[PDB]
Amino acid sequence: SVLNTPNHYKMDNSGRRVVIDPVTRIEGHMRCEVNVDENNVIQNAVSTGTMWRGLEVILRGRDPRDAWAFVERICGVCTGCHALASVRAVEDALDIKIPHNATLIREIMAKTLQIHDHIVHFYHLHALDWVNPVNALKADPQATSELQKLVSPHHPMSSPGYFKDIQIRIQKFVDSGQLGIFKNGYWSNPAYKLSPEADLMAVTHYLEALDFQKEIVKIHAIFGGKNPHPNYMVGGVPCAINIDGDMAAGAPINMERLNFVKSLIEQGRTFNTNVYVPDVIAIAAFYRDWLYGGGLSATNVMDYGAYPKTPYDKSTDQLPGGAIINGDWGKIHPVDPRDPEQVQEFVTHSWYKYPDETKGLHPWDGITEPNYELGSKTKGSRTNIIEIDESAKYSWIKSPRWRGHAVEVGPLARYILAYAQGVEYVKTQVHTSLNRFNAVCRLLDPNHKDITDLKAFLGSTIGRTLARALESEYCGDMMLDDFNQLISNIKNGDSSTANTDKWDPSSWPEHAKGVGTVAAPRGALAHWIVIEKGKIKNYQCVVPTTWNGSPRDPKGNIGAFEASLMGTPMERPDEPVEVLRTLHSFDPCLACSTH
């Protein structure tokens, strides 16, 4: 069939079918199927979420105050963001305002997550789509040092001897014949474009990032007890502050703990600016001719908006939200998670049932009733899927739409929204990053003509990858600001951390509903709660990867993952490096997507 989608794609499944299951180097479980034409160009793409647990179901009848801990376990990668969404939703429903320090500590935890998550995603999940560790063994260590000094002059770790020592260790691993995670990688595929020196630099940095990442999450351990899965609570934060008073050393937060947080913040800022951002820019330059993967990003993007400089005042959001549609960056449509005509979820192509499957349901009205059923065009059987039937139900992921539009969410969506809204920090990052990119390109090609078209630059798998790194850097700077504000508040006499006015359910209305939003690492997160007589009546989550990994809607619009693969040529369809590189650029969180 050839399907002409209302969002302007032609999904043609007559070419050769290529199945990727499992999709690895994601959180959770995904299957992807594509069709390639005679020129090995993708002309159809199918996103299937291959897991479901049913947290929305499980929450029914429980106490709203407990909900955050349950939904936190939607995901241990984006650990905490669901807790944050949850407490915000309950506080929205019950009209609870939290103390400033609680707002700040939650933002510090959120920014810690952003940084951790973005760094580990890029190195430990994404990099092997761009980096060939085998080719790193051919690198000249002295030339590697020279490259390093160019990519990041301030990073201290550049000795030729250091790069030689790393190489020796990878050579020994290879020589052992136990290739572990590198086993059967697609290392002879010409889609790998780094020099051996860039491959060695990047493997070196993979190891540096694995050592670093465990440090930043100590911020979560201080404010939240543990990482993964720090604690939260409705009405405040549990980490009470006592700097100077009786028993201060035994309080959660005291002078020594504050000093620890400062140290951790600065370590993260340094890694962002000296290792992560420079790497993504430099790798992008080696891939300057590979501008595939934009998908929906330069037409339809959305975020709820986050990090208001004035608590509870969204016009001060440092990552302002809204929706851009049809590629008009000059028009920011306001997004209201309360409006039943805006966010809606369809299940036409998902493994769920609604009484009227023609309807998209706003999440206060959402329904989660499983319906694992394969289309009669499936190749295989119920328990042995050879080629999934995407004309029928083909995913555990619901189909969210915004006013009927399919949109992309994530750091790239937020960067476009922020750029378009005049956020000068972001504008500076984009322009300086483009300049740095073109500088490295010209080192690689003196004959390089500078890239000036921002939609083409940003609206690509490279751009999606860059935006994530930039966001990490911005989050470190914002987190320092938050820390300094927390210290100022304490200095001016305010050590308060919780509002308990509405702790007791007897203080609650018999009926209430609320929505909590978060700028989660992967995009727009919200939780919608309906409370009845002290219990959860409905609890519906719509998560970033739900948006991005969405199957088709009743009208046939394709979601961000499917759109991003269309039109991409593959060097070797059965070694699908390009598909992995683009899907991974969304940082798919499949446990999140399905919850």
Binding site: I26, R73, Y186, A221, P238
Partner: protein, 267 residues
């Protein structure tokens, strides 16, 4: 040769994998490069699809009886097992196949050990812990390392024990290593002096909270929870739930999600 490890992932949130890489000592980098051979792990591995499946096939045969099977997450039995699909087939079939020729199993976390959040009422997927899925006839050790997630250094401590001392650690009657799971939180809790004196947090951010008083009255489940949180502690010994002001929620114990509200007293 380095010990072969196959790390499977069922229904999960991936918190146990995340915890593992937080290990302060040994570093995850060193575990993977030098201690074990991490031969399969959906989270970190280069290969996908058919190329990934092929490794499982090869490791199974080549190291038959000689690999450790680490499991994160758990198999669902509802939806014909297709609420967790790997390679077009139920995860349960993958788990069974690899369990059949494992030397031993490590059940990472509360999902693999007990069921964790997806098994909380009404358990829509019939998510089932590994030992129950394999049943009473399973003839190799199943080492339960529970917690949501377990402490990083507990995870790497179990592995370094087996590699250094050449045996399975001693297990309690629930299958948990006595190395880390043979005391309750409350049995080594630094807030215990306050419990003993009737000094409690009564309301969040009260005087008691600001002095680090005991969290029993705000629902701490430390009196019934076996783990190393109050001894080893979390994230390179930085903190644990109670130190940071929230009671234990019981997250290493079988059934903790259905034991009552987290803020209701341990009874």
């Amino acid at each position: 040769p380095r010990t072969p490890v196959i790390w499977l992932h069922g229904l999960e949130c991936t918190c146990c994998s995340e915890s593992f890489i937080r290990s302060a000592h040994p570093l995850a980098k060193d575990v993977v490069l030098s201690m074990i051979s991490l031969d399969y792990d959906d989270t970190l591995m280069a290969a996908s699809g058919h190329a990934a499946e092929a490794i499982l096939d090869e490791i199974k045969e080549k190291y038959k009886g000689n690999y450790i099977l680490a499991v994160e997450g758990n198999p669902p039995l509802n939806q014909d097992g297709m609420s967790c699909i790997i390679g077009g087939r139920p995860f349960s079939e993958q788990l069974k196949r690899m369990a059949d020729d494992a030397k031993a199993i490590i059940s990472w976390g509360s999902c693999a050990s007990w069921g964790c959040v997806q098994a909380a009422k009404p358990n829509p997927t019939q998510a089932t812990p590994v030992h129950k899925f394999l049943g009473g006839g399973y003839d190799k050790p199943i080492i339960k390392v529970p917690g949501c997630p377990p402490i990083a250094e507990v995870m790497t401590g179990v592995i370094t024990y087996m590699l250094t001392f050449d045996r399975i650690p001693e297990l309690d009657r629930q299958g948990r290593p006595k190395m880390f799971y043979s005391q309750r939180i409350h049995d080594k809790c630094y807030r215990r002096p306050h419990f003993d004196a009737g000094q409690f947090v009564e309301e969040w951010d009260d005087e008691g909270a600001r002095k680090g008083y005991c969290l029993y009255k705000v629902g701490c489940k430390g009196p019934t929870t076996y783990n190393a949180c109050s001894t080893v502690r979390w994230n390179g010994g930085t903190s644990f739930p109670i130190q940071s002001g929230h009671g234990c929620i019981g997250c290493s114990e079988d059934g903790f999600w259905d034991k009552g509200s987290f803020y209701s007293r341990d009874t």
